[PDB]
Amino acid sequence: TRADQIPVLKEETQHATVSERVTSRFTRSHYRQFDLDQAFSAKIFDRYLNLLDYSHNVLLASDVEQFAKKKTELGDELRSGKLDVFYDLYNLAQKRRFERYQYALSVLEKPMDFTGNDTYNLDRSKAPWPKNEAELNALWDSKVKFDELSLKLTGKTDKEIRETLTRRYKFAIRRLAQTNSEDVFSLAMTAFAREIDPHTNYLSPRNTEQFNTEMSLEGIGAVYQMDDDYTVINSMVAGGPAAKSKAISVGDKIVGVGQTGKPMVDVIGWRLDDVVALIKGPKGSKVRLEILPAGGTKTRTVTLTRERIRLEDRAVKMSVKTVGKEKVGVLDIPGFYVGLTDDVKVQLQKLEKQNVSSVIIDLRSNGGGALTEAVSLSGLFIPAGPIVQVRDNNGKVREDSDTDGQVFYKGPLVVLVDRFSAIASEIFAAAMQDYGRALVVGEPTFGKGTVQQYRSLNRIYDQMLRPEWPALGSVQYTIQKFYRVNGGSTQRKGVTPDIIMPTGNEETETGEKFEDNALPWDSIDAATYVKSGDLTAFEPELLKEHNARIAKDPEFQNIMKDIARFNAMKDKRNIVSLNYAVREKENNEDDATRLARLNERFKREGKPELKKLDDLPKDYQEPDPYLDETVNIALDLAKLEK
Amino acid sequence: ITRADQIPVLKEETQHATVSERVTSRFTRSHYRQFDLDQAFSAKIFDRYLNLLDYSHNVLLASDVEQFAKKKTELGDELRSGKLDVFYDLYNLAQKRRFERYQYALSVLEKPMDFTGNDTYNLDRSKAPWPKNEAELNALWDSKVKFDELSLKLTGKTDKEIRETLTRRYKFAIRRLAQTNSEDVFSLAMTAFAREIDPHTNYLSPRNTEQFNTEMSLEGIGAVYQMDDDYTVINSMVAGGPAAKSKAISVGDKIVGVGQTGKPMVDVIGWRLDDVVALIKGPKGSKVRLEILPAGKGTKTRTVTLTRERIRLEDRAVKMSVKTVGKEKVGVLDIPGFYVGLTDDVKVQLQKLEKQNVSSVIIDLRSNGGGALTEAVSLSGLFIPAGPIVQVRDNNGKVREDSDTDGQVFYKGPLVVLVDRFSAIASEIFAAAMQDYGRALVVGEPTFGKGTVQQYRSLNRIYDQMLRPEWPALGSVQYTIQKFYRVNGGSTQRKGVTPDIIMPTGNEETETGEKFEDNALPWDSIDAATYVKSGDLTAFEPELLKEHNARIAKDPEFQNIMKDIARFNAMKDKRNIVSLNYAVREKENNEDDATRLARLNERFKREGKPELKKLDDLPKDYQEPDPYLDETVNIALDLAKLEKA
Amino acid sequence: EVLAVPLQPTLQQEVILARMEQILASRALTDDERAQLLYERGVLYDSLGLRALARNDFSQALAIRPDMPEVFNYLGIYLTQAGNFDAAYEAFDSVLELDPTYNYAHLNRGIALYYGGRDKLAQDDLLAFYQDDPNDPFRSLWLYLAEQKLDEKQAKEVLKQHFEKSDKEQWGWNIVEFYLGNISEQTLMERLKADATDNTSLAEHLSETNFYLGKYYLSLGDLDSATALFKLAVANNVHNFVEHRYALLELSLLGQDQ
Amino acid sequence: VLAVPLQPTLQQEVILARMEQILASRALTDDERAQLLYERGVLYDSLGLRALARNDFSQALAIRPDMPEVFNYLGIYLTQAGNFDAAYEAFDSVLELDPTYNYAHLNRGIALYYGGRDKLAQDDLLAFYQDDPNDPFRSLWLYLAEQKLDEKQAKEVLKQHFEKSDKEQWGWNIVEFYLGNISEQTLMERLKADATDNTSLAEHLSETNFYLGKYYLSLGDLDSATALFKLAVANNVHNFVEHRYALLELSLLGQDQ
Ligand SMILES: [Ca+2]
Ligand SMILES: [Ca+2]
């Protein structure tokens, strides 16, 4: 491919109908009540550009203006199914991209000079659009230099760096000519979908490729989305191999997929389906994943054995922490699987045999599960009452209740949560707080307080009236919003713990409250419930004993000085230096710190000290000071209840 | 060859139990008359069953009525539950007591006949006390056989002929008595029930193989025959039947002899009806001759010869004619019956009557037994703009008005309606409406007074013959469902229409009419309908009535008919009581003939017609004149004269 | 002022109807099974006020099997509604000939004789019907209604005796107590609301009560109050209560006087 | 003012018994069978046998899935069940198969209204109003939706529709009550005047009591509203939109208890 030998893409005949069909469902059935007026079309227009050119370095300001005269008119066009503005902008910038990758291949002949005072901003999302071919070459001067230093900082020769980036910019050229009309339609609908809320989506029909996997035959336990050009881990399945190796976290981005023995294949700016196909393959086997965390670059590798979810793994696990005389039961609930409430009841009877003084329910990094199990589990600790109010895309509020007037553990209760405790875990924790049944410890929760469903765009008369038999897609849109028994929504706030562990008293990267166009937080009328108790009396003495212990604790001391560091250097979180000596030093010093943190840990534990950070066993388990401190909080509560 | 009790003792068939229950349902619930089948009503039923078994009170003994009359009040319950045995135990008893009388009667035929006394015979023994002992029973059949003997003597028979005729009659009376079915006992049991309610109510036995055969050859001389115990009676006549044409036959006439194509008169006295009717129903063209005992007089019997046929349509049709009187003219419509299509025929003829410049019209409805109620109303409506014609009440209380609704009058000139004692249902409705609207003068006699309608209902049920195939077809009931009322709120029951000018035979109490039928429903009123009277002729009545009396004073027809009324009313207290002296009876016979011949010969001298020397030389097709019509024409002209003033 | 939501066909009634169509269209039925199922659909059509459809099934049942008392009963009920009292008497008599223990034929023949202007004989049937279950207040009511045409005072004495003899558990004795004078129209309606547990029990109470109320006002000559009360009885759509059918007949008689 | 609640007519019951005999034969093309299953569904619906109707309508779709008429009734029934989402899909299916099927704008409008989306209900009911402006019930249904946005401009628009129109159709009398021009008693006086028999009476009452019910519902008088909805539904003119929405309203008052 040397010129415009790239096919100019056409709308298929079906796409007319499908646009009308999705405008019916979002404009009428969506939980969020928006007007597809002039203001809303504008915002749709903007987000389509940001899907075409995420980094504001392909299109010219004079190319956005050529179509932005009719930005307010894009509502009417989606209703009527006039798709040409979408196809004319994706055929443009299919051109403009080839221009950039052509230019980029040219700049790989020029010499690389990492000795300057210069900078690279990774957030160009609200950038002014490029004026001329010069600034388009200044931004791709910057871009190819960053790509060159990233590979240098992982110890690569001038030779290796030039042939890797050649292969990247020419497969980027070849990828650009493999896209079909379903890819440009898919992105057009996404601009519509994502302007309503971030959980709304259009989803293209599956090809035989899904047919043939099911016909004849299994990856790691993760579900993936697209940050532009980046494959993001959306969520992880409870007790999956992904979830077991606690290195992988929600919102993290892959840059390469290696197999056993064979080389690391770089997956920079790919279509998801091909990236995910590299990871997926039958039982027993292994796959290694080089990935980079959420918010410069870090050369992190994870290695995982492929599996089917094992029931005992996703099962609740119980154990007793002892502190001299006193004991504390701990229920690790990885997920809200059908049958959880029954397994919990079994383990609670074991906990009453061992004369514990208090119990911790651990719901850190629990992606929700059966709303039904959240309610039954809530109900084990209260006599009876409402647990959650549900409001639908119609005005209707439903109350879900526990109605046996029974308490299977009436003793002191702590719920441990973090920023990855989702839907179910939030409902349980919120109910235990509102009823005055339990102290809530850890970080503010995720805040995804809404539910989505899928709907086929197929209609029963399609095959009878059409040649175009290709199954059509689905939409995915928000139908329901959870509210607490106190009438507060879990949206965007989730549950604030009664004692916030130091990472939670910070702005986070992850959580619904930072998602693009997340629905607001709002209230309704409180349900009718009898509070089982009140722990607000105890809060100040529990909070004072907590601060006293974490001040004399090396783990919490270490985690607090990284927070004093992470918030101080927040100014430049997106601005990266292009000087090899500055970047190598900051890489060397991270490793020196990490090694000295591990070696300070091992000196306490009587474990021999590491001389290289590379000698650390790949299965190393980080300790849990959040759990060990929550046990003390749980015992303070058992004491304070006299 | 019956010489003692070889008469088989009859018993109920299996079906009869159910049929009594079924019949008691319909009469006690569906009948227009709302009676209680209680104690009082069972008694009256019992009485009428005795009177059906022994009409003349000369077969049963007061000791035999008393044996069963202890439980007479209980016969309501028995008819409900279908316990028939009191009916069968009385009919098996009376059947033997009847055998007793006819063998004793054969004994009295040997004794001498003596017609020389001062003695009499009462022909109504219906409210007579029951005979006490065998001495009353032989005194009453001494009397019975003497009357039977004098009847045959007075028709010129010798001692010899009289003894052999009564021998056959008394021996066939015995032989007939042992042909009777259980169906004949049940038929009469139900009839006691039926006829105690009203006289038009009936139980009707299923038709056999014989009715099927008649239809197979499918004639009836145009008459319907009812039975008054021990007599075959003409109940009604069909419009333009051969019966109705030869005017020598009137309603209520008793048949005592039937003739053949060529042959003698065979007596049918004491017969069952189906067998009597079989004598008459013969091939068309080949005639049959019948004897006639008429209503309520010492038995002088007429013989009539009539041919058989089907009802020819133009005979049943309306007939029009013009009477002239010097200059003045009067149209006459002879309406024999209310056939479907009458009102259309009338309209045609009324337009012909417009052409001939007549000054009044007469509608003649003498001897018109009704017809289609719908035609009564349309025909009524030709002479009024619009209004109600008749109100009909049903068994359940519903009153319905039948109306003429075109606001049209197709005649509007002076109108007379001519009626007699044989004008029934439809004729009454028309005449009653013409009087009440003040549209027409009504002339002639008080009408029949049958102001009720009856229907038939099968006692068959759709599950008979899945549950009881042994059973044959069952009967019907016939019961009163409806009662006619005038637009004035008066019923036609029992009164019918009183004419504005009563022609002399009408004022005098009549033999025939609903008001003399046994247990006839009463007359009653309802609320008047709303109608606008088309006129008022009460003004003219006295002048019309005085000119009428002036003419009929000078008229030998009317003079003759008024002298027979002074004769029939003077000999009224002793009217059924008949003498047993041959000299007094032959005299009464001779003088009736002398009178009739002198009436005919006075008529012939007026007409210029040659005189008769013996009453037997009168041709059998002689046509009696109509002075009622001729006088009604003058009444109609008086009205046109009085009206145009 | 007490109103129900007028009853709507239930989902079970509609499912069963659609199922009865599929089965009657099949050859899964003996002559006897076919006749039974045509009777059962007639009862269901009648439950929904589809009397002509019901009559059609009832007549087909007889055609197959003419010795069915159940069907004769519904045929007489329908001749009563049409005003053909004569025919109706014949049908119920047919019931009791086929089965002398078919008690409701006394009820329905009694009612038909009543509307037929034959109160003495209606008392014979309704007295008998009363004797077969004396604690059914509606037997005392129907008997009372017939006996008040014969003798207004002995009717009230007999009604009063039936009430004092009974265990007085069944709701309908409250309508009797109103007829007697023991309670007011307002107390009747207050007890009506108290005893109704749901919209269906409410509707049934109203269909029953407003018909007897309708009859009360009709006996005082209040045609407007009668007419309203009959209409409001019938507006509960409890088709197949005798009270619904006789409410409709009474409105028919109020129509036919216009 | 009460009608005798309507009873099934003899013609409806004859036709239904016939439709059974014909559907039980194999004499019918697929197209004729689908038309006659639709005709019987309309008749079942006309008698308030909605589950039997839905059953016939679904059979028709199975055979011939391109029937807008059937889609319309299916969405009406998803509205009555409170499944507004499903209902909007059904009416959109109508208008895709036939954009001239006007009553789908009525019924989608009504469904959006009960579905708590009046701006979009006004889009459909304004359109439906435009297609026949002299139909007073289009001004009524539009008004009811517009009243949730702004009660003042709703009444101005209503009043404009009345003044624009020829005012011949009876239902303008219900508009005049909404506007203030006449009293509840004058409305009912004209209702009796214009009714010629029990059927015309019952239809006027089913219509009028529903709109009266909505008026009282907006003042917060739940007892007068409940009574009036009940009395609308007691006329048994099943198949009137007013009868169906009377029943839905009663349902909402019930599910609040
Ligand atoms: Ca509980
Ligand atoms: Ca006329």
Author numbering:
A (entry chain D): 27 to 243, 246 to 323, 325 to 671
B (entry chain C): 26 to 243, 246 to 672
C (entry chain B): 30 to 287
D (entry chain A): 31 to 287
From the paper:
Prc (also named Tsp) is a member of the family of C-terminal processing proteases (CTPs) which features an embedded regulatory PDZ domain inserted into a serine protease domain. In Escherichia coli, Prc is involved in degrading abnormal proteins that are unfolded or partially folded and marked cotranslationally at the C terminus by an SsrA tag and that are exported to the periplasm through the Sec translocon. By associating with its adaptor protein, NlpI, Prc is also involved in the regulated proteolysis of MepS, a lipid-anchored hydrolase specific for PG cross-links. The activity of Prc strictly requires the PDZ domain, and the PDZ deletion completely abolishes the protease activity.
We also crystallized Prc-S452I/L252Y bound to NlpI in the space group of P212121, which differs from that of Prc-S452I/L252Y alone (P3221) but which is the same as that of the substrate-bound NlpI–Prc-K477A crystals trapped in the activated state. The crystal contacts of these P212121 forms involve the NlpI dimer and the NHD and CHD of Prc only; hence, they provide further information about the structural difference between the two conformational states. The structure of Prc-S452I/L252Y in the NlpI-bound complex shows a similar resting-state conformation, with the root mean square deviation (RMSD) being 0.62 by comparison to the structure of Prc-S452I/L252Y alone. Interestingly, unlike the liganded Prc, the NlpI-complexed Prc-S452I/L252Y shows a flexible helix h9 with a poor electron density map, and the coiled region connecting to the PDZ domain is partially disordered. Moreover, the docked PDZ domain in these resting structures has higher B-factor values than the protease domain, which is in sharp contrast to the findings for the liganded activated structure showing a relatively rigid PDZ domain, helix h9, and the substrate-sensing hinge. For the sNlpI–Prc-S452I/L252Y complex, protein was crystallized with a solution containing 0.1 M imidazole (pH 8.0), 0.2 M calcium acetate, and 11% PEG 8000. The structures of Prc-S452I/L252Y, sNlpI–Prc-L245A/L340G, and sNlpI–Prc-ΔPDZ were solved by molecular replacement with the Phaser program, using the structure of sNlpI–Prc-S452I/L252Y as the search model.
